[PDB]
């Protein structure tokens, strides 16, 4: 992909005690046009990992396909081995990098969340193959709007409960709805705990517009 | 090959113990009778 | 170009304008943009005419062979997936916006969008083409869950009429086709049959 | 048949036979027995897995394979060949998914893999596969299905089927079941039973029973029979063996 | 005799003679034994020398930090497969950043070795392997034949006069799962010892040991690093 | 009858590899001795006529400044392996900036072992094994090493080894006279003695070739005079 | 998986014969007979299309095939091989026409076809074609009649016969036929020389005839063949 077409905007992630939460609005934008206002930008990849993607939705679908096939191929063996979130992140990094180095990149920015072996995992993969781990992640405008808040919290209270994390995510998605002109008040939250991957249906953000009466 | 089929089953019949044959000592034979029939390559030969 | 597809209970409803342009000139004022991919799967084309025709041919080929090899009427999702594979793999050399819509004994009436990038999503209703931009409003305010076949027919007819009115790259005649287990019902809405809207004067 | 008509798969015998394929089949015949039986809500697989040494682990040399998440495979014969065919089947299923969007229909996977097997019975440059295998699947849109494939490339649909040494005996035991009305649950016991019957404790030493589900009880996923149901069926079998 | 020279030729009795003859190449190799506890996997190998003034053939090879192998057969085929296994392990670490599960590596070896048993003028790999490894499912000992078949073993031995070792191991299986490392290596050394006439015995010159475990990367001991294991054995007398 | 070049015998052996081993038994005999002071290599030239210039007989070559090689059997086949060895040493120096270990070079040459075969291969790939035995003699970080290689591809380190037609005799003779504390002088002396025992013609300065590699001195092929000085002390 | 045998199956005997070629020729001289006559103002090819049952539909396969608009073909020997050669000859003809925008000369098509036949006596893993071809053509005013055999060699004939009894047919042609013959008389003597073998009642569906005058090559309709076979 040299020219992205239908795109999704920011994706959020935050670690908490014994789990990870990821959020993403359900919009595919064609330029400025909110053309598909009901697509998911989150995938369940096995039981201990999940993926969220900003950027070109077609390339995201391709990665969704490939990844799915990889997981199926592996679960066919039944050797009591399964892809760890770090392994999926590694793979994804090498993939993006390889396409980047062929000058035909996958125009995605992706957030991988997972829980395995008692540890939370949250990884970011660029379309250039810039990859890293962090306690909080935000793609796109989320890196300029949401991540200041998320970092502010996580450097005053490093360990969050699932509830604190969900609240945090709702507030960040709210900020995004206020300031990102290609976002949507209808988003998904996915959570990975030891119970598995749960993907909560279309959620709305409550908004305040009292400053509309502070013109004069 | 059919007669044998009877005779074969008959050995199952006499076999173990059941003076009275059934539908069991039949098929067993039948395939059995059609099993070894693999050792008979070319059993047809027309004239001129 | 303005293409449209609505799902109802027994099946689907397709519509398109008939104008194919090269610049501001109308090379074909009476184009058929609804293309049968199988006996009960149709595709609506938009974008490059060469590209869409080529891809439609290719998918027709593949899906034909597949349906013969399974001896079953193909799934709509299957046609859509094949279009999606070609439109994605060659996204840098194709400009095609496809709407695959049809009926299928396994999932009933369905509509899938394959816009230019090569993504695929199922939709209750879909629009595409240059003129589509101008009827997002109407189609958003008029749509309603549980329309009858005739209702959907009137719906697409009106929407296409509006788009044709506003978009210069759209016009001519409207082509409809309803698809259900019954079969394919095509009609052509021309001249006075096309819904009119009283235009503001003073 | 030191005649030369039996050294290659590219060579017909003067009575119109390909003897290499027959000899491959014969390699299958010398293998331990595996059976599979289709009922009204799925397919059950059973394998008589002969233990050649106490040094082998429990669950070594599995002869039940997951070809796709909805398709299980049961083999008999030269095991290398069977593994290679499992990989081929897997890849056929994968490619199908990626190109057409859905899980591969069993009849089609069977046709494909069997055409792949048949492709090896035409030339001198390769040898026919010394294995026969069964494919089982269950879907709500197609039902329960069971196919078997032999070294010649023949693929047939079955209600009940067996491969290996005691093919025919097993079939005779199977025809006494009314599986078109029974459920997989009831069937597992009967499979284990038929295995225990067919097994020859004199010629063959000790053995281990492999069992596979695939049906409405597993939501379409081909799975291994739990240790619980397995031991239950084994007990039922041992006790049914005393009569 | 017309069914003897090609791998693509089934015999009229359902066998492939080049594969079997290939399997006989494993028996030509010096014996090697592989056993596991619940935490460790141990290869013990009887090295072997041409003349007294020549060093002993190495018999245990390092593949990855968690996987080592013991070879029996054509050394060139051994090295071929060994390079393939090392490459696969490196590919796995490169792409996934996790060590490659032993069972998958073995499956790859099966796939690789099956191919030449089906194409004309190709020959099967004339080498048998014992693979000792540790992953998320614990210790493993696998066995690979030239027939491209493989087995998951609880303990095993291959090579010339390995039947003896097979018998001994078959006696003391029940002990192994609870043994400590020293006792495990001991058992392997005894198994290996029963594969010799009463005239000759184990030495620090013709024995190699290899260990991998939950708290131990794969390691090879030979020369003087073996002596602490040997000096701790019962001088089994005829 | 005709079978393939990649056929096994029922006994477990590749007939081509065995036959190649047989082909070595016809080569000129060579002796290599490893010693803490260096490694020595001697080989008989087997001149078939006084008209043949013996200086154009080299069964001893320099793979690199610290690795020499003595060859027996089909010399023409040896040339290819020697070239591949040289190139390999130089590539390793190129890439890592350090010399090759004798064991690594040996291994590299030994990888061209069983690389022969008919169908399913390149049009320029080998039709048969190399009918040659090699003795690599070098000095590295582990000190003086000597390896032996045969067409089986098995290479093995050796203290003192003989290859060639008089392999058995010379090897026995070597066993009778070798200990891991000889001087290089004793090694060369021994080698020339055994060589004289097994050689068909009378041993002289233009009848064998002799080379040493010592830790402080690069590969050295003995000149005529340097040979004479040693043969003098028979 | 598959490759191709790379060695020749056609090899010199110690006598210096290419045995496979002569055995291929044996296969030719076992097929239904065909006669070809070049006759001043045109060319006639005829062959015995005698089936083995009322069940076979004679209006489905033909033995006298057009290669282009001005060149025609018949064969003796194996059917399938003929089919292959006819496809290939049409292809060659069309290559020539793409390049020179002029219909291929009969001699050149004969050359090319013959080259194809020769390839399968030297390329690997194959047998030679078991077919002799008679190729008629109209080019440059004159008519043309060539024969190509499985060796890949070709000869120009005024008239000739191939297939069973080709020797007696050949002699009959040498006697009961000469130049200054119109196409009609040539058709006559062609059916006459074919009748020197046609065991049975020669019907209009038992034989196939093609002509090639300076109006193009064409197959005679069954009607026309009936009218001619009224003699």
UniProtKB/Swiss-Prot annotation, chain A:
Q: Name one GO cellular component term.
A: ciliary basal body
Instruction: Indicate the principal place this protein occupies in or around the cell.
Output: cytoplasm
- Offer an example of a GO molecular function term for this protein: lipopolysaccharide binding
Phosphotyrosine modifications at: 57
Disulfide-bond pairs as recorded: none
- Indicate whether Ribonucleoprotein appears among the record's keywords: no
Which keywords does UniProt give here? Acetylation, Cytoplasm, Disease variant, Host-virus interaction, Nucleus, Phosphoprotein, Proteasome
Q: Where in the cell is it found?
A: Cytoplasm; Nucleus
Q: GO BP, one example? A: negative regulation of inflammatory response to antigenic stimulus
Q: Induced by what?
A: Up-regulated in fibrolamellar carcinomas.
Q: Which domain of life is it from?
A: Eukaryota
Note the subunit structure: The 26S proteasome consists of a 20S proteasome core and two 19S regulatory subunits. The 20S proteasome core is a barrel-shaped complex made of 28 subunits that are arranged in four stacked rings. The two outer rings are each formed by seven alpha subunits, and the two inner rings are formed by seven beta subunits. The proteolytic activity is exerted by three beta-subunits PSMB5, PSMB6 and PSMB7. Forms a ternary complex with SMAD1 and OAZ1 before PSMB4 is incorporated into the 20S proteasome. Interacts with PRPF19. (Microbial infection) Interacts with HTLV-1 Tax protein.
Q: Which family does it belong to?
A: Belongs to the peptidase T1B family.
What is this protein's name? Answer: Proteasome subunit beta type-4
Gene it is expressed from? PSMB4
Span of the entire protein shown here:
46 to 261 of 264
Curated annotation (Swiss-Prot), chain B:
Q: What does this protein do?
A: Component of the 26S proteasome, a multiprotein complex involved in the ATP-dependent degradation of ubiquitinated proteins. This complex plays a key role in the maintenance of protein homeostasis by removing misfolded or damaged proteins, which could impair cellular functions, and by removing proteins whose functions are no longer required. Therefore, the proteasome participates in numerous cellular processes, including cell cycle progression, apoptosis, or DNA damage repair.
Query: Which gene codes for it?
Result: PSMC6
What is annotated about its quaternary structure and interactions?
Component of the 19S proteasome regulatory particle complex. The 26S proteasome consists of a 20S core particle (CP) and two 19S regulatory subunits (RP). The regulatory particle is made of a lid composed of 9 subunits, a base containing 6 ATPases including PSMC6 and few additional components. Interacts with PAAF1.
Q: Which residues of the full protein are shown?
A: 342 to 389 of 389
| UniProt name for this protein | 26S proteasome regulatory subunit 10B
Q: Where would you find this protein in the cell?
A: Cytoplasm; Nucleus
Domain of life of the native organism: Eukaryota
Assigned protein family: Belongs to the AAA ATPase family.
Curated annotation (Swiss-Prot), chain E:
In terms of Pfam families, this protein maps to:
Proteasome (PF00227), Proteasome_A_N (PF10584)
What is the recorded function of this protein according to its Swiss-Prot or TrEMBL entry?
A: Component of the 20S core proteasome complex involved in the proteolytic degradation of most intracellular proteins. This complex plays numerous essential roles within the cell by associating with different regulatory particles. Associated with two 19S regulatory particles, forms the 26S proteasome and thus participates in the ATP-dependent degradation of ubiquitinated proteins.
What is the location of the Glycyl lysine isopeptide (Lys-Gly) (interchain with G-Cter in ubiquitin) cross-link? 112, 205
On subunit structure and binding partners, the annotation says: The 26S proteasome consists of a 20S proteasome core and two 19S regulatory subunits. The 20S proteasome core is a barrel-shaped complex made of 28 subunits that are arranged in four stacked rings. The two outer rings are each formed by seven alpha subunits, and the two inner rings are formed by seven beta subunits. The proteolytic activity is exerted by three beta-subunits PSMB5, PSMB6 and PSMB7. Interacts with NOTCH3. Interacts with ZFAND1.
Reported induction: Induced in breast cancer tissue (at protein level). Up-regulated in liver tumor tissues.
Classify the main location. cytoplasm
Return the GO cellular component terms, semicolon-separated: centrosome; cytoplasm; cytosol; extracellular exosome; nucleoplasm; nucleus; proteasome complex; proteasome core complex
An example molecular function term from Gene Ontology annotations: lipopolysaccharide binding
Which positions does UniProt annotate with glycan attachment? Answer: 107
Q: Which UniProt keywords apply?
A: Acetylation, Cytoplasm, Glycoprotein, Immunity, Isopeptide bond, Nucleus, Phosphoprotein, Proteasome, Ubl conjugation
Has the keyword Ubl conjugation been applied to this entry? yes
UniProtKB/Swiss-Prot annotation, chain G:
Q: Does the keyword Nucleus apply?
A: yes
SMART domains in UniProt = Proteasome_A_N
Q: What GO cellular component term, any one, is given?
A: extracellular region
What is its induction? Down-regulated by antioxidants BO-653 and probucol. Down-regulated in response to enterovirus 71 (EV71) infection (at protein level).
Q: Which domain of life is it from?
A: Eukaryota
Disulfide partners? none
PROSITE patterns recorded for this chain? PROTEASOME_ALPHA_1 (PS00388), PROTEASOME_ALPHA_2 (PS51475)
Q: Which residues carry this modification: N-acetylalanine?
A: 1
- Pfam families membership: Proteasome, Proteasome_A_N
**Which residues are recorded with the post-translational modification Phosphoserine?**
6, 13, 15
Effect on the protein of changing residue 109 to V: In a colorectal cancer sample; somatic mutation
Phosphotyrosine: residues carrying this PTM: 5, 23, 75, 120
Q: Which residues carry this modification: N6-acetyllysine?
A: 69, 170
Q: Name one GO biological process term.
A: response to virus
Compartment(s) of residence: Cytoplasm; Nucleus
Record text on subunit structure and interactions: The 26S proteasome consists of a 20S proteasome core and two 19S regulatory subunits. The 20S proteasome core is a barrel-shaped complex made of 28 subunits that are arranged in four stacked rings. The two outer rings are each formed by seven alpha subunits, and the two inner rings are formed by seven beta subunits. The proteolytic activity is exerted by three beta-subunits PSMB5, PSMB6 and PSMB7.
Family membership:
Belongs to the peptidase T1A family.
Its function, per the record, reads: Component of the 20S core proteasome complex involved in the proteolytic degradation of most intracellular proteins. This complex plays numerous essential roles within the cell by associating with different regulatory particles. Associated with two 19S regulatory particles, forms the 26S proteasome and thus participates in the ATP-dependent degradation of ubiquitinated proteins.
Q: What is this protein called?
A: Proteasome subunit alpha type-2
Organism in which the protein naturally occurs = Homo sapiens (Human)
